[PDB]
């Protein structure tokens, strides 16, 4: 089996900056066709992963010209002239030159920018949700820079640990921020026993933590 | 135009047997030579085999995790290409897709020997179908409204909660609706169950209808959630 490295895992770029990502075969992908045998795919998330570069050079239909292959023998390239914001998303390089045909561990491209603050939302339970005996309050942290965010849940000022979970997006393809939903799960008693529930944000965006509370038992 | 659809995902038992479709449209499905790909959560890409056209003996070559398990063949006057899977292995999870390689084309030059000659590659995929190797049962989801709340712009939504398992679909108003529009990655609860919420920014309030459609077809649930204040 032919091992596929690539260089580095996480790449941080500026949009309008170059970027590099590196790819070495333990074995050389001979142009015995004429070709050397390697490709490119873009994996961006929500879609399957597509092809960018093949034959280690050649551009794929619709890929856009800032995107290039290069390198020879073990030792290949793909280069971003100038970043954008769709650019964003994991990289693989595959070599199709002899079976079984082998992927990179991927690299994540990740768009550079300004901080963001974060629009902080509140959601009770439904009258739904309670009639089923659990209770769901979601804080909704929206479109923020960076992803670094301290969500912290206080139920009539008292200060929660362990019974909330939070689930981060990727990256805009646009605007190149995420959002936050910090969702704290108590059961049906335990949210008539209380009803003060706010949760409290601690973003680079905010200068003092942002609070947003609702009252209801 | 060109696309591959793939189907049969589900939820096996371990040392259980699954058979995957791929239909393919667009292309002259006999020409070319398909792969079988697979990513397992949070994880790469990685090949699990070939099959050539036709033409070129319709043979096949498999990733060693899977070779003796796992059959690929296909059906050109169906356009379908299979993957039946045996012996399963929870380490078999993930979701797999389908997708064309070395085209090929036959052409007789003036002259008689009729070339047989080759492109590339590795063109078509997906979306993929998802395959769950695990004891446990199948769970659908509960839907609860995530309200437009008063505490310019306002955000409401769906909790999709306790389902079992991955994935869940979840589109607004059949599809009209994309724009701020943020699904987010399902998180496993200590119960052993994911949940996902899926929310939409607005500014209009009660002048127009909000929908969350949300699919598991692990369990064959669809529910269709109208969200008011």
């Known amino acids: 089996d032919i091992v596929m490295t690539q260089s580095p895992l996480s790449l941080p770029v500026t949009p309008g900056e170059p970027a590099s990502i590196s790819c070495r075969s333990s074995?050389?992908?001979?142009?015995?066709?004429?070709?050397?045998?390697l490709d490119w795919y873009l994996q961006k998330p929500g879609q399957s992963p597509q092809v960018l570069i093949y034959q280690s050079k050649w551009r794929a239909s619709g890929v856009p010209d800032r995107f290039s292959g290069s390198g020879s023998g073990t030792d290949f390239t793909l280069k971003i002239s100038r970043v954008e914001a769709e650019d964003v998303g994991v990289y693989y390089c595959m070599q199709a030159l002899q079976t079984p045909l082998t992927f990179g561990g991927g690299t994540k491209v990740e768009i550079k920018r300004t901080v963001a603050a974060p629009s902080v939302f509140i959601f009770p339970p439904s009258d739904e949700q309670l009639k089923s005996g659990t209770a769901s309050v979601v804080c909704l942290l929206n479109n923020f820079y960076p992803r670094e965010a301290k969500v912290q849940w206080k139920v009539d000022n008292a200060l929660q640990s362990g019974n909330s979970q939070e689930s981060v997006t990727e990256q805009d393809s646009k605007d190149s921020t995420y959002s936050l939903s910090s969702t704290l799960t108590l059961s049906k008693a335990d949210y008539e026993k209380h009803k003060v529930y706010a949760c409290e944000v601690t973003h680079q965006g905010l200068s003092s933590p942002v609070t947003k509370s609702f009252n209801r038992g | 135009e060109v696309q591959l659809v793939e189907s049969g995902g589900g939820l096996v038992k371990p040392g259980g047997s699954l058979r995957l479709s791929c239909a393919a449209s667009?292309?002259?499905?006999?020409?070319?030579?398909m792969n079988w790909v697979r990513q397992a959560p949070g994880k790469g890409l990685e090949w699990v085999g070939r099959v050539k056209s036709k033409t070129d003996g319709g043979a096949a070559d498999y990733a060693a995790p899977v070779k003796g398990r796992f059959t690929i063949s296909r059906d050109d006057s169906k356009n379908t290409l299979y993957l039946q899977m045996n012996s399963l292995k929870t380490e078999d999870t993930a979701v797999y897709y389908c997708?064309?390689?070395?085209?090929?084309?036959?052409?007789?030059?003036?002259?008689?020997?009729?070339?047989?000659?080759?492109?590339?590659?590795?063109?078509?995929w997906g979306p993929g179908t998802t395959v769950t190797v695990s004891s446990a049962s199948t769970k659908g989801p509960s839907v609860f409204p995530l309200a437009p709340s008063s505490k310019g712009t306002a955000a409401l939504g769906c909790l999709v909660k306790d389902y079992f398992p991955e994935p869940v679909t979840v589109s607004w108003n059949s599809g009209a609706l994309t724009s701020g529009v943020h699904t987010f990655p399902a998180v496993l609860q200590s119960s052993g169950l994911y949940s996902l919420s899926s929310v939409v920014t607005v500014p209009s309030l009660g002048t127009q209808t909000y929908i969350c459609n949300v699919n598991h077809k692990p369990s064959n649930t669809k529910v269709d959630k109208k969200v008011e204040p």
């Open positions: 074995q050389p992908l001979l142009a015995m066709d004429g070709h050397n045998y």
């Open positions: 667009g292309f002259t499905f006999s020409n070319a030579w």
């Open positions: 997708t064309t390689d070395q085209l090929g084309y036959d052409f007789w030059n003036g002259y008689y020997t009729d070339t047989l000659y080759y492109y590339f590659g590795m063109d078509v």
